[PDB]
Write a protein that binds this ligand. Structure first.
Ligand code: CLA
Ligand code: CLA
Ligand code: CLA
Ligand code: CLA
Ligand code: CLA
Ligand code: CLA
Ligand code: CLA
Ligand code: CLA
Ligand code: CLA
Ligand SMILES: CC1=C(/C=C/C(C)=C/C=C/C(C)=C/C=C/C=C(C)/C=C/C=C(C)/C=C/C2=C(C)CCCC2(C)C)C(C)(C)CCC1
Ligand code: SF4
Lengths: 61, 34, 30, 75, 74, 41, 735, 80, 160
């Protein structure tokens, strides 16, 4: 995955679970949740972006 | 003592005395310490 | 019409059932 | 609501009505406010239940819209 | 908005009311200033307010106010 | 008349116009053919 | 400020009055208590069950004793249709002379009995105030037995283990066979031996029961196999209940219908019914495996039930351990079954009155139906609440899942959105259209043109009535036809009795129905569907949702999750129960309103009033409530009072409690904490009262506690006002 | 006293700490995020349960979670 | 006949209802004067009442013991104009509404600002979609066949 890639959220406790988002940036450092994904639908708190782990996102073909 | 005096003997007894002693006991119990 | 003896012994038996109730109540602990 | 209920019942019971040619005053309800407005059951029966008769029996008449609005406002 | 509402009230008094009939019989004619179109059976709302008129009885007291103003014509 | 037509395209104005038109043709059907309890056919 | 919530140290350290409030409301939640094990849980539940059964038996004994002592049972025996049964005497110092005179019955002021116990005890063969006293004595003895057992099974050497408590097969075998079948067998024995001769004038007491043969042939036909002999010579159509005139000798018969005199089921019919039920349940109690190598292991039965094509997932493999290890699953199942059972009791004890002269006791009929329907609604809501509790605290996804695939229960959480969406669709459909038709009828009738009403004939339900033999709708279907195989088959067994009862205008058996019945049944369906929607949504969403994907970590009952994420008021599963209680009350109110109005019109004779005015809402409001509330509100006026004065007082009391519930529901906390702080300052800063200070800091009721208190006020006011209305209206309208 | 837990989804944006009305949360060094900081809850005895902390949390389902528990005169917000 | 009901053309209580309504209307008519608009309105009311009662009588309508038309909605085509034909009409109209709404939602859902086009309707596109709903039964059973009607697993689900 990279910037601009489309991924499916696999985190169950997510307002965008099973949904598709756009990767903003994948951090190359040793952070726990490097993948930053932007969504079109705001969550219940109003935010439309979140940091996800490498195993919590699945790239769409 | 006839059977018809039992209501006048028991209804005040129950309905007033039992609340008083029950309130005393419950208040004492719930206000206890350790 | 029931007699005084009938009501009296029913009251006495009710008392015995009351002592059995507090024993169960106290055995179910404070 | 309590103020307007007091006004309606008191006026209907002790002010409004008709006057006979000899000067006898007959009111809409008949002076029941003085003795029956002192209990909640009195307010429920001699005012609410009694004067709600016209609203519930308005169907088929020219006041049927008032019954319909009564029901809709309850809803 | 308030002026438009007042203009509507006066227009209804002028056109859809029995104000002229009520003037000649204030104690026996009920004030009415809104007639109801005959649709879906709603014409039953046009009550027998008196003065050869059918309509909804008016409880806003406009007839009495207009009479106090000296208004004697529609 | 470019933004006025866009204003008329807003949700409230369009809903009001559509509901007014809808109530209008319903009321006029019920005026020209009143008291229709069953299908006319 | 300590030692009251002995079971919870967290509450005992609360410096506020919240500790006392929460100590009451958490006393029976044994699973949440401090220093808690499963063995202690089951043992305490067992002892509490014993105490509860003792309480029930003591309550029944008290009813028996008060009927025997202050009632008029013996006088009611000689004239059951004119004498009004008396529940118990009244001694209230607040009575005036007028109240004493109005409530005066025979020798002392007394309350009429609306429980129908007089008819029930008369039917089962009680004729003396000494028979009731014997029953009270025996029931107090049984209560003493149960209290002793409850104490005993908390003793060290007599406390059962978890294996005994979770021994499903043994408990099922014994419960079914022993409890149901043997209790039915003993009840058939009593029915025959005592009740059957007592209805025929022969007294069979605890003295002449070893020498009075229940049947003249005396157990010879039973062993000989000539079981028809017990059905020969039944009670004739001119039999006077409690007397030998026109009686028979049969003890087990098929007659169908009702007794011609008491307008109730034949005693020989009910004895045969209980004998058949006893045999069936005793047979069914041998199903499960015990120490003798034959029977069933229900784990194997559950595991083997997976459809081969595959549509229920892996089937019921994990259900055995799920149910066994959870007391809330079992409690929910039991509560649902009990709710259905008591709904059945309510629906059958009015259509098929089982007790002598109970059909003509209109106030007790209404009271019994209303009581049982309200209990049914309560039990159903409790079943769903405990299902939600099981989801929160007892459900384990690992047990209900095998290699990724989910079992029959775990799959209910996969299409939970589908279930909730379709429940919502059904509720919206029914509500929209029932309200639309009702309001259409309202507007059309109001405009003076009732002919334009939308009145749908309940043909589907009338079809069922015709199928059971009602020749009123000209369907000629199954039992309305004399040539159908359904009729020829039972033409010699129970049709003549059944047809004579179903085709009678004075019965409640299959009451004639019209468009009003159709509309009110659709309203009932809407209420049931909406209550089910709320409860099912709370149960399935108990473990989490999108707004709170960790709701299981907060428990079954918590106030909220805060104002964040848009606001999370009433987000817990307990709040779903709390909201569904209102809908249960509304649905039971609709059901009881329908039943009571239908039966008031049937008893008064103006059934045309219901059939015409029940199709529109104003018809209900004017002809049921406003019309029948006149006798009730005039229980006391500025001119006098009647024996219905207590019912008017209860009416107003219910309204007051209802509106206090409105207080507790509309106004929330936070507004009551600051006011309490002002009161605290006032008390602390005033002389002559500074000498007295609280030990627990006064605080406002918690959010969940406030919801509970408002719901309790709402429900108590609801029940009290409707009970007062139904009873007083029936009494004051039908004499 | 209430229970406050911090989860490694913390991005160290400090909005929880500067929203706590009773000084329960604080920022401590960390190496699991870009900011190099994570929220901590070392003074939960002062936690009142107002949940302002998690109203300011930008992470998807929160990184600070408040579990209401036993009540205290501090946690009940009693000035008396 | 069906359910013990009888045709309204032979229902005495139906004619009694008609006669009572007409009598009330005529009594109301008596208290007005000449050809004044109130009398014209009451006469129109009488005429409409008579026409409605006559039409209900000659309509294959079954009346109960209260003299009111009862609807036979068990499904039989004999009384098909009471429920079945209005049912078909409503199903057509409501399917039209739902189809045009869904088509508009899916059409503006693929533009740059989908939310803007929901408070400010694209009236040209809205008119284009709305008049295309007459084929909604055919369009629905041409999109379901192609799998374009139902989502499969991109739909979101809660935690449990
Ligand atoms: C649960 C059953 C029950 C209930 C609800 C009532 C209700 C009543 N009884 Mg009563 N009674 C009962 C059983 C019951 N009785 C039994 C079994 C006996 C035989 C001993 C009596 C003997 C009796 C007499 C002699 C009198 C009453 C009277 C009364 C009335 C006033 C209350 C009173 O003075 O009580 C007094 C009750 C007793 C002395 C007997 C004890 C009642 C039972 C055994 C205890 C039941 C406890 C219950 C299950 C739960 C207790 C809760 C507690 C922990 C708070 C009231 C209507 C009076 C009356 O008629 O006034 C008009 C009266 O004079 N009762
Ligand atoms: C089962 C419940 C119950 C019972 C039996 C009673 C009984 C009574 N109430 Mg009562 N009450 C109750 C619940 C009850 N109340 C509740 C819950 C409320 C609130 C809603 C009230 C509100 C209430 C009011 C407002 C009034 C009563 C009154 C009365 C008395 C009736 C009037 C009369 O003729 O006596 C006349 C009374 C006397 C001649 C003197 C009685 C004084 C007490 C009761 C005697 C007790 C003796 C006692 C053993 C002494 C102990 C030893 C001591 C010397 C050290 C009577 C004693 C009236 C009354 O008398 O007021 C005092 C009155 O005005 N009640
Ligand atoms: C602001 C107050 C007000 C209110 C509440 C009303 C209300 C009403 N007017 Mg009205 N009117 C008003 C001001 C108002 N008017 C003013 C200021 C004028 C002067 C121009 C009029 C002139 C007027 C006429 C000439 C008529 C009414 C009519 C009506 C009635 C039917 C309206 C209708 O169906 O239109 C529907 C409107 C639309 C669908 C447009 C959108 C209704 C009760 C009619 C009536 O009563 O018929 C008997 C009628 O003929 N009005
Ligand atoms: C928007 C929907 C709608 C539709 C489809 C119609 C349709 C019609 N109207 Mg109409 N009308 C409407 C709304 C509508 N009206 C409204 C809102 C009003 C004001 C209250 C009127 C007032 C009106 C009058 C006054 C007349 C019509 C008439 C007519 C008919 C001939 C034109 C036709 C059937 C005419 C007709 O057929 O009467 C003979 C006629 O004279 N309409
Ligand atoms: C939701 C349930 C419901 C249903 C099924 C009906 C059904 C009906 N109502 Mg009704 N009504 C309802 C709710 C409902 N209403 C409510 C809630 C109210 C209170 C506001 C009313 C108030 C009301 C009145 C006051 C009247 C009716 C009337 C009618 C009848 C005539 C319908 C009509 O105009 O058709 C004709 C119109 C159409 C079929 C519109 C569709 C035509 C389109 C353009 C076809 C185009 C495609 C080809 C019909 C049986 C009238 C009647 O005669 O009763 C018997 C009547 O006078 N209703
Ligand atoms: C023959 C032996 C026997 C008998 C008689 C009982 C009897 C009882 N046991 Mg029990 N038990 C047994 C063996 C037995 N057990 C064994 C062997 C075990 C160990 C495996 C247990 C373990 C056990 C536990 C752990 C508990 C009990 C409990 C109970 C009591 C249940 C409460 C009650 O009073 O229900 C009375 C019920 C009836 C009289 C019958 C109910 C009638 C139903 C509701 C009507 C249904 C009809 C119909 C189906 C309705 C539907 C209509 C249809 C068309 C579908 C009851 C007294 C409980 C209790 O309260 O303990 C004190 C409890 O907690 N037992
Ligand atoms: C045999 C049936 C049965 C059993 C064994 C239980 C057992 C249990 N339930 Mg349960 N429940 C039941 C039926 C049952 N319930 C029904 C029918 C409902 C629907 C109404 C519920 C709804 C329910 C909820 C919503 C909850 C429970 C909870 C619990 C657990 C703790 C109970 C507790 O703390 O009590 C506390 C007891 C009280 C607070 C006493 C309340 C008394 C009420 C208000 C009536 C008293 C007023 C009285 C009528 C006064 C009359 C007024 C007068 C003027 C006329 C416990 C395992 C709780 C739990 O945590 O489960 C794990 C929980 O949250 N249940
Ligand atoms: C008269 C009062 C009233 C009315 C009409 C409703 C109506 C409704 N409630 Mg409700 N509710 C009420 C009081 C009421 N409630 C109270 C006091 C409580 C206790 C807090 C609840 C608690 C409650 C819960 C917990 C739930 C509902 C649900 C529903 C919906 C059920 C579906 C339905 O009937 O759709 C038809 C709708 C109507 C008949 C009413 C609106 C129609 C109007 C007249 C249209 C007018 C257009 C112009 C519906 C909107 C459920 C829901 O949302 O289901 C989807 C649900 O989950 N309600
Ligand atoms: C117009 C598009 C549209 C479509 C195709 C659907 C389709 C559906 N809805 Mg729905 N809904 C809509 C709009 C729509 N809805 C709107 C606007 C609301 C807000 C009031 C809702 C509220 C709603 C609820 C609360 C529920 C549904 C449900 C459902 C499902 C069952 C059908 C039902 O109960 O109808 C419900 C229809 C209504 C309650 C009335 C809708 C209001 C109008 C008529 C629709 C709006 C028309 C729109 C403005 C047209 C503009 C298009 C134009 C610009 C081209 C189905 C998937 C139910 C479900 O999940 O079952 C599976 C359910 O519980 N919907
Ligand atoms: C939440 C939950 C829960 C609960 C649930 C519930 C509560 C349910 C309910 C349920 C119900 C409540 C059900 C019901 C059912 C019923 C039925 C199922 C019925 C049937 C019937 C039938 C089948 C009949 C038939 C017939 C007829 C109709 C005619 C006559 C004869 C005959 C018999 C044939 C639990 C805990 C479990 C678990 C968890 C989850
Ligand atoms: S509740 Fe949330 S905000 Fe209030 S103190 Fe505890 S943590 Fe800080």
């Amino acid at each position: 995955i990279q910037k601009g890639s489309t991924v499916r959220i696999l985190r169950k406790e997510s307002y965008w679970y099973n949904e598709s988002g756009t990767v903003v940036v994948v951090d190359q450092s040793k952070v726990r949740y490097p993948v930053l994904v932007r969504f079109t639908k705001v969550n219940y708190a109003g935010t439309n972006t979140n940091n996800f782990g490498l195993n919590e996102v699945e790239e769409v073909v | 003592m006839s059977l018809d005096l039992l209501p006048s003997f028991f209804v005040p007894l129950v309905g007033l005395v039992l609340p008083l002693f029950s309130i005393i006991g419950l208040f004492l119990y719930i206000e206890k310490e350790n | 019409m029931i007699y005084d003896s009938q009501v009296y012994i029913a009251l006495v038996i009710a008392v015995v059932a009351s002592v059995l109730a507090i024993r169960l109540g106290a055995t179910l602990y404070n | 609501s309590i103020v307007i209920f007091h006004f309606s019942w008191k006026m209907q019971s002790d002010v409004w009505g008709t006057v006979s040619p000899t000067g006898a005053v007959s009111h809409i309800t008949g002076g029941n406010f003085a003795q029956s407005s002192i209990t909640i059951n009195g307010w429920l029966r001699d005012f609410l239940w009694s004067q709600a008769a016209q609203v519930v029996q308005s169907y088929g008449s020219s006041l049927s819209a008032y019954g319909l609005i009564f029901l809709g406002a309850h809803f | 908005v308030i002026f438009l509402w007042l203009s509507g009230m006066h227009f209804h008094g002028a056109y859809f009311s029995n104000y002229s009939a009520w003037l000649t019989n204030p104690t026996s004619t009920k004030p009415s200033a809104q007639i109801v179109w005959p649709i879906v059976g709603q014409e039953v709302l046009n009550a027998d307010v008196g003065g050869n008129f059918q309509g909804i009885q008016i409880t806003s007291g406009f007839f009495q106010l207009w009479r106090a103003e000296g208004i004697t014509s529609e | 008349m470019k933004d006025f037509l866009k204003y008329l395209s807003t949700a409230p104005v369009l809903l009001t116009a559509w509901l007014t038109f809808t109530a209008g043709f319903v009321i006029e059907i019920n005026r020209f053919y009143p008291d229709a309890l069953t299908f006319p056919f | 400020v300590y030692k009251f919530p002995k079971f919870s140290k967290a509450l005992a350290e609360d410096p506020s009055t919240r500790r006392i409030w929460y100590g009451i409301a958490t006393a029976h939640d044994f699973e949440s208590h401090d220093a808690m094990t499963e063995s202690k849980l089951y043992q305490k539940i067992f002892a509490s069950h014993f105490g509860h059964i003792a309480i029930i038996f003591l309550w029944t004994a008290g009813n028996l004793f008060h009927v025997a002592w202050q009632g008029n049972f013996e006088a009611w025996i000689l004239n059951p249709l004119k004498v009004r049964p008396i529940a118990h005497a009244i001694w209230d110092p607040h009575f005036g002379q007028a109240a004493y005179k109005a409530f005066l019955k025979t020798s002392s002021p007394a309350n009429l009995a609306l429980s129908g116990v007089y008819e029930w005890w008369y039917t089962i063969g009680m004729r003396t105030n000494n028979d009731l006293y014997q029953g009270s004595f025996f029931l107090i003895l049984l209560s003493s037995l149960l209290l002793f057992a409850g104490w005993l099974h908390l003793q060290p050497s007599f406390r059962p283990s978890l294996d005994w408590f979770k021994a499903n097969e043994y408990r099922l075998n014994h419960h079914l066979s022993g409890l149901f079948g043997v209790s039915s067998l003993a009840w058939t024995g009593h029915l025959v031996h005592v009740a059957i001769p007592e209805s025929r004038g022969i007294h069979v007491g605890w003295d002449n029961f070893l020498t009075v043969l229940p049947h003249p042939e005396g157990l010879t036909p039973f062993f000989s196999g000539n079981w028809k002999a017990y059905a020969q010579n039944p009670d004739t159509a001119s039999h006077i209940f409690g007397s030998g005139e026109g009686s028979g000798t049969a003890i087990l018969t098929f007659l169908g219908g009702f007794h011609p005199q008491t307008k109730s089921l034949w005693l020989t019919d009910m004895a045969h019914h209980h004998l058949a039920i006893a045999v069936l349940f005793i047979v069914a109690g041998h199903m499960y495996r015990t120490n003798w190598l034959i029977g069933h292991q229900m784990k194997l039965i559950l595991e083997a039930h997976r459809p081969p094509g595959g549509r229920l997932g892996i089937g019921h493999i994990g259900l055995y351990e799920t149910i066994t290890n959870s007391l809330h699953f079992q409690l929910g199942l039991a509560l649902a079954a009990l709710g259905v059972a008591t709904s059945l009791t309510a629906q059958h004890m009015y259509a098929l009155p089982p007790y002598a002269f109970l059909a003509s006791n209109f106030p007790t009929q209404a009271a019994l139906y209303t009581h049982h329907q309200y209990i049914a609604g309560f039990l159903m809501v409790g079943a769903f609440a405990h299902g939600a509790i099981f989801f929160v605290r007892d459900y384990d996804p690992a047990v209900n899942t095998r290699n990724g695939e989910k079992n029959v229960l775990a799959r209910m959480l996969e299409h939970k959105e589908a279930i909730i969406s379709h429940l919502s669709w059904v509720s919206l459909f029914l509500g929209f259209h029932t309200l639309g038709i009702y309001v259409h009828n309202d507007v059309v009738v109001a405009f003076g043109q009732p002919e334009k009403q939308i009145l749908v004939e309940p043909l589907f339900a009338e079809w069922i009535q015709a199928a059971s033999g009602k020749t009123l709708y000209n369907f000629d279907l199954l039992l309305a036809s004399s040539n159908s195989p359904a009729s020829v088959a039972s033409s010699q067994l129970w049709l003549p009795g059944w047809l004579s009862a179903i085709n009678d205008g004075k019965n409640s058996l299959f009451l004639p129905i019209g468009p009003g019945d159709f509309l009110v049944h659709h309203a009932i369906a809407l209420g049931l569907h909406t209550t089910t929607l709320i409860l099912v949504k709370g149960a399935l969403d108990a473990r989490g949702s999108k707004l709170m994907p960790d709701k299981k970590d907060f428990g079954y009952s918590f106030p909220c999750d805060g104002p964040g994420r848009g606001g999370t008021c009433d987000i817990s599963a307990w709040d779903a129960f709390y909201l569904a209680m209102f809908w249960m009350l509304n649905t039971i109110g609709w059901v009881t309103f329908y039943w009571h109005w239908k039966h008031l019109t049937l008893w008064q004779g103006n059934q045309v009033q219901f059939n015409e005015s029940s199709n529109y809402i104003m018809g209900w409001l004017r002809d049921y409530l406003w019309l029948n509330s006149s006798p009730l509100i005039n229980g006391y006026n500025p001119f006098g009072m009647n024996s219905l004065s207590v019912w008017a007082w209860m009416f107003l009391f219910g309204h007051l409690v209802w509106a206090t519930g409105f207080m507790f529901l509309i106004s929330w906390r936070g507004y009551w904490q600051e006011l309490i702080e002002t009161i605290v300052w006032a008390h602390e800063r005033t002389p002559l009262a500074n000498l007295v200070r609280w030990k627990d800091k006064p605080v406002a009721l918690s959010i969940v506690q406030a919801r509970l208190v408002g719901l309790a006020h709402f429900t108590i006011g609801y029940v009290l006002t409707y009970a007062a209305f139904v009873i007083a209206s029936t009494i004051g309208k039908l004499g | 006293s209430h229970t406050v837990k911090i989860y490694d989804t913390c991005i160290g944006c400090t909005q929880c700490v500067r929203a706590c009305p009773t000084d329960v949360l604080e920022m401590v060094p960390w190496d699991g995020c870009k900011a190099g900081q994570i929220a901590s809850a070392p003074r939960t005895e002062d936690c009142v349960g107002c949940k302002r902390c998690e109203t300011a949390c930008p992470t998807d389902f929160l990184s600070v979670r408040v579990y209401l528990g036993g009540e205290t005169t501090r946690s009940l917000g009693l000035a008396y | 006949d069906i359910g013990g009901l009888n045709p309204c053309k032979d229902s005495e209580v139906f004619q009694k209802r008609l006669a009572k309504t007409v009598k009330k209307l005529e009594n109301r008519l008596k208290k007005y004067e000449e050809g004044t608009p109130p009398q014209i309105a009451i006469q129109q009311q009488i005429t409409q009442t008579k026409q409605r009662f006559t039409r209900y009588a000659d309509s294959n309508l079954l009346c109960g013991n209260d003299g009111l038309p009862h609807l036979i909605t068990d499904g039989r085509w004999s009384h098909g104009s009471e429920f079945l034909l209005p049912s078909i009409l409503f199903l057509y109209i409501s399917g039209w509404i739902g189809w045009v709404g869904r088509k508009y939602i899916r059409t503006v859902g693929q533009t740059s600002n989908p939310t803007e086009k929901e408070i400010i309707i694209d009236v040209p596109l809205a008119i284009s979609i709305m008049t295309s709903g007459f084929l909604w039964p055919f369009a629905a059973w041409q999109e379901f066949l192609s799998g374009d009607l139902i989502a499969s697993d991109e739909t979101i689900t809660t935690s449990p």
